[PDB]
Write a protein that holds these residues in place. Structure first.
Motif, PDB file in Angstrom:
ATOM      1  N   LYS A 137     -24.186  94.892 111.194  1.00  0.00           N
ATOM      2  CA  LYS A 137     -25.195  95.803 111.224  1.00  0.00           C
ATOM      3  C   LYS A 137     -24.795  97.165 110.798  1.00  0.00           C
ATOM      4  CE  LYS A 137     -27.843  95.229 114.636  1.00  0.00           C
ATOM      5  NZ  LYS A 137     -28.034  95.052 116.110  1.00  0.00           N
ATOM      6  N   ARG A 138     -25.773  98.162 110.559  1.00  0.00           N
ATOM      7  CA  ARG A 138     -25.632  99.266 110.312  1.00  0.00           C
ATOM      8  C   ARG A 138     -25.063 100.068 111.776  1.00  0.00           C
ATOM      9  NH1 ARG A 138     -28.230 100.390 105.316  1.00  0.00           N
ATOM     10  NH2 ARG A 138     -29.106  98.472 104.930  1.00  0.00           N
ATOM     11  N   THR A 139     -25.163  99.667 112.971  1.00  0.00           N
ATOM     12  CA  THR A 139     -24.818  99.950 114.249  1.00  0.00           C
ATOM     13  C   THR A 139     -24.219  98.591 114.808  1.00  0.00           C
ATOM     14  OG1 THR A 139     -27.062  99.712 115.107  1.00  0.00           O
ATOM     15  CG2 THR A 139     -26.509 102.008 114.346  1.00  0.00           C
ATOM     16  N   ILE A 140     -24.190  98.976 116.357  1.00  0.00           N
ATOM     17  CA  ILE A 140     -23.609  98.002 117.211  1.00  0.00           C
ATOM     18  C   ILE A 140     -24.423  96.736 116.856  1.00  0.00           C
ATOM     19  CG2 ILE A 140     -23.536  97.156 119.620  1.00  0.00           C
ATOM     20  CD1 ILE A 140     -23.683 100.849 118.678  1.00  0.00           C
ATOM     21  N   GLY A 141     -23.700  95.474 116.697  1.00  0.00           N
ATOM     22  CA  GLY A 141     -24.065  94.069 116.682  1.00  0.00           C
ATOM     23  C   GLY A 141     -23.701  93.292 115.599  1.00  0.00           C
ATOM     24  N   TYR A 142     -23.327  91.887 115.650  1.00  0.00           N
ATOM     25  CA  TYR A 142     -23.190  91.305 114.578  1.00  0.00           C
ATOM     26  C   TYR A 142     -24.405  90.035 114.501  1.00  0.00           C
ATOM     27  CZ  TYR A 142     -21.520  87.508 118.178  1.00  0.00           C
ATOM     28  OH  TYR A 142     -21.541  86.751 119.143  1.00  0.00           O
ATOM     29  N   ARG A 143     -24.767  89.670 113.191  1.00  0.00           N
ATOM     30  CA  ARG A 143     -25.861  88.980 113.085  1.00  0.00           C
ATOM     31  C   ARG A 143     -25.310  87.703 112.544  1.00  0.00           C
ATOM     32  NH1 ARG A 143     -30.312  91.088 113.992  1.00  0.00           N
ATOM     33  NH2 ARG A 143     -30.977  92.998 113.747  1.00  0.00           N
ATOM     34  N   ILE A 144     -25.401  86.562 113.254  1.00  0.00           N
ATOM     35  CA  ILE A 144     -25.241  85.271 112.856  1.00  0.00           C
ATOM     36  C   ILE A 144     -25.867  84.746 111.876  1.00  0.00           C
ATOM     37  CG2 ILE A 144     -23.631  84.595 114.854  1.00  0.00           C
ATOM     38  CD1 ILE A 144     -26.234  83.028 115.637  1.00  0.00           C
ATOM     39  N   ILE A 145     -25.684  84.156 110.722  1.00  0.00           N
ATOM     40  CA  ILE A 145     -26.799  83.716 109.674  1.00  0.00           C
ATOM     41  C   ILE A 145     -26.267  82.152 109.376  1.00  0.00           C
ATOM     42  CG2 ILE A 145     -27.413  83.666 107.429  1.00  0.00           C
ATOM     43  CD1 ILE A 145     -27.479  86.874 108.161  1.00  0.00           C
ATOM     44  N   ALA A 146     -27.038  81.247 109.401  1.00  0.00           N
ATOM     45  CA  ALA A 146     -26.528  79.712 109.130  1.00  0.00           C
ATOM     46  C   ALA A 146     -27.564  79.405 107.882  1.00  0.00           C
ATOM     47  CB  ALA A 146     -26.715  78.882 110.166  1.00  0.00           C
ATOM     48  N   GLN A 147     -26.972  79.279 106.753  1.00  0.00           N
ATOM     49  CA  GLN A 147     -27.639  78.954 105.321  1.00  0.00           C
ATOM     50  C   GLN A 147     -27.117  77.375 104.947  1.00  0.00           C
ATOM     51  OE1 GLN A 147     -26.576  81.107 102.003  1.00  0.00           O
ATOM     52  NE2 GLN A 147     -24.430  81.684 102.593  1.00  0.00           N
ATOM     53  N   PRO A 148     -28.048  76.749 104.408  1.00  0.00           N
ATOM     54  CA  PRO A 148     -27.731  75.446 103.962  1.00  0.00           C
ATOM     55  C   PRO A 148     -26.962  75.271 102.884  1.00  0.00           C
ATOM     56  CG  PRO A 148     -30.210  75.741 104.293  1.00  0.00           C
ATOM     57  CD  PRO A 148     -29.374  77.009 104.008  1.00  0.00           C
ATOM     58  N   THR A 149     -26.290  74.179 102.599  1.00  0.00           N
ATOM     59  CA  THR A 149     -25.519  73.991 101.323  1.00  0.00           C
ATOM     60  C   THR A 149     -26.228  73.952 100.077  1.00  0.00           C
ATOM     61  OG1 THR A 149     -23.816  72.393 100.535  1.00  0.00           O
ATOM     62  CG2 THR A 149     -26.000  71.347 101.143  1.00  0.00           C
ATOM     63  N   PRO A 150     -25.906  74.577  98.950  1.00  0.00           N
ATOM     64  CA  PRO A 150     -26.572  74.777  97.763  1.00  0.00           C
ATOM     65  C   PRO A 150     -27.528  73.683  97.474  1.00  0.00           C
ATOM     66  CG  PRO A 150     -24.443  75.276  97.395  1.00  0.00           C
ATOM     67  CD  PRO A 150     -24.328  74.675  98.804  1.00  0.00           C
ATOM     68  N   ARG A 151     -27.475  72.542  97.840  1.00  0.00           N
ATOM     69  CA  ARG A 151     -28.115  71.140  97.623  1.00  0.00           C
ATOM     70  C   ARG A 151     -29.315  71.423  98.543  1.00  0.00           C
ATOM     71  NH1 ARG A 151     -26.254  65.507  97.339  1.00  0.00           N
ATOM     72  NH2 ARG A 151     -27.698  65.508  95.658  1.00  0.00           N
ATOM     73  N   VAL A 152     -29.321  71.556  99.720  1.00  0.00           N
ATOM     74  CA  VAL A 152     -30.591  71.516 100.677  1.00  0.00           C
ATOM     75  C   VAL A 152     -31.545  72.707 100.395  1.00  0.00           C
ATOM     76  CG1 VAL A 152     -31.319  71.551 103.061  1.00  0.00           C
ATOM     77  CG2 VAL A 152     -28.950  70.430 102.465  1.00  0.00           C
ATOM     78  N   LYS A 153     -31.088  73.664  99.870  1.00  0.00           N
ATOM     79  CA  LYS A 153     -32.066  74.865  99.766  1.00  0.00           C
ATOM     80  C   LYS A 153     -33.102  74.370  98.668  1.00  0.00           C
ATOM     81  CE  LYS A 153     -29.087  78.683 100.615  1.00  0.00           C
ATOM     82  NZ  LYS A 153     -28.080  79.752  99.929  1.00  0.00           N
ATOM     83  N   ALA A 154     -32.824  73.489  97.505  1.00  0.00           N
ATOM     84  CA  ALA A 154     -33.758  72.961  96.689  1.00  0.00           C
ATOM     85  C   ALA A 154     -34.745  72.153  97.158  1.00  0.00           C
ATOM     86  CB  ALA A 154     -32.969  72.072  95.373  1.00  0.00           C
TER      87      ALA A 154
END
Length: 153
Positions: A32-49
């Motif tokens: 982030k621009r300031t204090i904090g870490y943002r966890i992001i979980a994204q699918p494999t390139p196949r699941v997004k379709a």
DNA sequence: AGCCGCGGAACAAACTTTTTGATCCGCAACCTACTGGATTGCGGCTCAAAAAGTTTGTTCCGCAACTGTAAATGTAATC
């Protein structure tokens, strides 16, 4: 109308149904621009379709109430401030638990209140292909993820 | 969404430092000369006893980052 058209494109829906597709998520962290870490979980390139396709299928019979400029087509951030230009005061809420606590139990009943009928097999498909398991274990807790293409709708 | 060791804590028996309620013993008083009885009385000094003040061994309480097949993505900005 999900299971009927699921196998029409990329007829590999027989597999990846029992092989925990919700587990198919990569976790990284953006600063982030300031204090904090943002966890992001994204699918494999196949699941997004598949998720985009099921979003398109779901959009066929839904309605989104106005005054919620949250990721609706053809509505940028300007119309959010256009409504608020004529006011003098403001009270800015900020909700906690950013998309990471919206359980699938709170979507099926939301659709039931929405007056749309969903099949039990289709309900399992929605629960399994449109959510993320943090514990990565069987019979775990399913929570929506910040980063999935199916998160906004 | 689960809960590691760490260190304070909430309690609770033992030590430990004084608050109190007599007992005593010089110690000047009588009384008269002086141990006057066969006397009192009165104020420092000391005694354990017990209601107060720490000190120390045990038991739960809480909390962080990420998890087993898994994205490098030209520019700016949103949750």
């Amino acid at each position: 109308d999900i299971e009927t058209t699921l196998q029409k494109a990329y007829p590999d829906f027989d597999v990846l149904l029992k092989s925990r597709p919700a587990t198919h998520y990569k976790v990284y962290k953006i600063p982030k621009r300031t204090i904090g870490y943002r966890i992001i979980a994204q699918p494999t390139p196949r699941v997004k379709a598949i998720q985009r396709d099921i979003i398109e299928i779901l959009k066929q019979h839904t309605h989104i109430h106005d005054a919620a400029t949250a990721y609706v087509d053809g509505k940028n951030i300007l119309d959010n401030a256009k409504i608020h230009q004529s006011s003098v005061y403001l009270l800015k809420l900020d909700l906690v638990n950013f998309f990471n606590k919206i359980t699938p139990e709170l979507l099926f009943k939301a659709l039931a209140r929405q007056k749309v009928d969903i099949s039990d097999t289709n309900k399992n498909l929605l629960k399994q292909f449109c959510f993320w398991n943090r514990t990565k274990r069987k019979n775990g807790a399913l929570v929506l993820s910040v980063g999935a293409p199916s998160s906004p709708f």
